[PDB]
Amino acid sequence: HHHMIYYGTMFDHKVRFSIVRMREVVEEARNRHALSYLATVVLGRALIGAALVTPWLAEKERWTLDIEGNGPIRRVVAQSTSEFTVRGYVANPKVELPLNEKGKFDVAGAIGQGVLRVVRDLGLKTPFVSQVPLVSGEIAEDLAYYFAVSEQIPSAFSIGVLVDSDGVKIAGGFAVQIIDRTLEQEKVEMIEKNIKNLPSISKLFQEAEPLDVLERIFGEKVGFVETAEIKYKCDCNREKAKNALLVLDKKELEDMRKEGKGEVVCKWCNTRYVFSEEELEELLKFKVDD
Amino acid sequence: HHHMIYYGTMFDHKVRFSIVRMREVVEEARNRHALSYLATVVLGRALIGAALVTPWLAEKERWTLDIEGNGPIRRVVAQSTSEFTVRGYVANPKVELPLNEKGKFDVAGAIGQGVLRVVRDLGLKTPFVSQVPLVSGEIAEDLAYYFAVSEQIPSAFSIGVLVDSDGVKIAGGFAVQIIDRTLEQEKVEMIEKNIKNLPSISKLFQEAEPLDVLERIFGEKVGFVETAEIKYKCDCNREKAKNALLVLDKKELEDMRKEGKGEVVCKWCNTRYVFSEEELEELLKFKVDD
Ligand SMILES: [Cl-]
Ligand SMILES: [Cl-]
Ligand SMILES: [Zn+2]
Ligand SMILES: [Zn+2]
């Protein structure tokens, strides 16, 4: 299953864990947005990030990771939900760069100097937003820093996307978080050591099943694990596109009407919504009557 | 002393407290900005808020409260520093509204529906920022909720500003915060009860010295207490104003040059900086020379 998260807790519930295989989801993002190889990795990592926190979201929460910087990708946005769905986008889907010195996709260079935001939308009038400076721009470590500093949850994220000309081959990772800091220091140290010892996801996920990866982290096999299916999903529809156009100035709608057509593209899933001259005339007529 | 903070901890350092009398500081904000009565109270409360957290800032921190809403004041910004200074401003210094039903200044109405932000500028590349929805728009409680939710520091703030035609008469308040949540529930309960029982600041500060107010909160007299002087202070100067003009488009500087003069007004302290035609020529000469 290449769209599956596994999750649970260890050590009398003082540690929580998440591990995901989601090449299918990242492949869908790549195709919907026609992402370059580099943009696939950057956004993929962000999507994995969002996915990994899904088990821990409140009811009907939307959780958004919003990384913004001065590198040529400019912005990376990944949203997950309590329903185990994700969606996301980058400002520059066609970004290309030389590989880094170690021959990997230059995620850090794509993002450049900037910041990481987490938006928690939990059904109050406006969402909680927390912003921190980037640590490295590799996404994993940036997100672990957010958790340590804003949420006071010591964290390790490990995340990897492997993509070639036939598409995304691996897109997965894990998250280990200390939710109760009275956890014995030797359990802390051992977890730390075991993770630091693991190969990067691209290599680890070709060699080990998710549950065996976890056994390696915790020094013993895990106990109870829950699973869920991660899906790429957006809530856009045509009604919403039409409303998007109704908020525009009369002049914009006139200009489309003389152009012969109006188009709305959903930024999250790249779905295009095309409106005819008549449909625009209808919306304009509505603008005057309202 | 009407620009003074007192601070310490109680119960084996599990609770920290802050209490401030600062009419002089709030009076100066009112004169610099030519604040209306209502804008005096709104900004004053925010300045008190910022002042109350000064003892607990990191070294060289600037801590900024930024409340933004749809009421007629629009925005309220108060910054404090590790050097026990403050500065602040509102978007609409002349705002007026009817008194609320209880005959008080309508702080909540002035702010309206909106959000509270805290910016922690601690010498990293960009600051920590945390945003929460407003709870009531009275400021004290909104700030207490920021602390409970973003910093996980259960908190009580009580804040009051009394102003008439001779100016600010009282501008003070206190903060009590649980920095170690293992604190016995009966101390928690007693503190809560004692604070809830207090009169509002406008009344209490006419009747009780700061240390006696704290005795009332904690059920016994406090122990070791530190003091500091709170001062209104800004870091603007003319060199900075000249730089502010250098960042403007050539065209803006040309228009001022034909206008005969250029003005920069510091938003924090309402100091105005006036530049002659020759000085604008100088900067322009420097625009095409850079
Ligand atoms: Cl995978
Ligand atoms: Cl006072
Ligand atoms: Zn969509
Ligand atoms: Zn100034």
Of B220, B279, B288, B219, residue with least CA distance to B251: B288
Ligand 4 center to B270 CA (angstroms): 6
Contact in structure between B230 and B20 (CB atoms under 8 Å): yes
C-alpha–C-alpha distance, residues B162 and A245, integer Å: 49
The answer to whether the CB atoms of B130 and A131 lie below 8 A apart is yes
Determine how β-strand A114-121 pairs with β-strand A231-232. unpaired
- Please give the residue of chain B at the shortest CA–CA distance from A123: B133
Whole-angstrom CA distances from A6 to A19, A199, A213, A231 are 5, 20, 11, 14
Instruction: Count the Cβ atoms, other than its own, within 10 Å of residue A166.
Output: 7
Whole-angstrom CA distances from B70 to A237, B40, B67, B112, B146 are 30, 18, 10, 5, 19
Please list every residue in chain B whose beta carbon sits closer than 8 Å to the beta carbon of residue A129: 129-131
Phi, psi of B173 (to 5 degrees): 175, -175
Contacts of B226 (CB under 8 A, 6+ apart): B6, B7, B8, B55
Please list every residue in chain A whose beta carbon sits closer than 8 Å to the beta carbon of residue B127: 133
Ligand 2 center to B207 CA (angstroms): 12
Closest listed ligand to the CA of A267: 3
Whole-angstrom CA distances from A259 to A187, A246, A255, B110, B142 are 66, 17, 6, 45, 49
Distance from CA of A17 to the nearest CA of B (A): 23
Angle between helix A250-259 and A277-289 (nearest 10): 160
| Resolution as reported, in Å | 2.2
Helices (H), chain B: 23-33, 37-53, 107-111, 140-146, 185-196, 201-204, 210-218, 238-246, 250-259, 277-289
Helices (H), B73-209: 107-111, 140-146, 185-196, 201-204
Of A252, A272, A271, residue with least CA distance to A263: A272
Q: Which among B124, B130, B150 has CB closest to A133?
A: B124
Please list every residue in chain A whose beta carbon sits closer than 8 Å to the beta carbon of residue B129: 129-131
Of B25, B20, B45, B47, residue with least CA distance to B210: B20
Q: Which domains does chain B carry?
A: 1-233 (3.55.30.10), 234-290 (3.90.1280.10)
Please list every residue in chain B whose beta carbon sits closer than 8 Å to the beta carbon of residue A126: 114-115, 131, 133
Tell me which DSSP letter residue A147 carries.
Answer: I
Asked if the C-beta of A152 comes within 8 angstroms of chain B's C-beta atoms, the answer is yes
The answer to whether the CB atoms of A131 and B129 lie below 8 A apart is yes
Bridge partner list, A273: A264
Distance from CA of A267 to the nearest CA of B (A): 25
Q: Which among A127, A129, A133 has CB closest to B126?
A: A133
C-alpha–C-alpha distance, residues A87 and A50, integer Å: 9
Helices (H), chain A: 23-33, 37-53, 107-111, 140-146, 185-196, 201-207, 210-218, 238-246, 250-259, 277-289
Please list every residue in chain A whose beta carbon sits closer than 8 Å to the beta carbon of residue B118: none
| Burial (Cβ within 10 Å: 0-12, 13-18, ≥19) of residue B77 | buried
First to last CA, chain B: 51
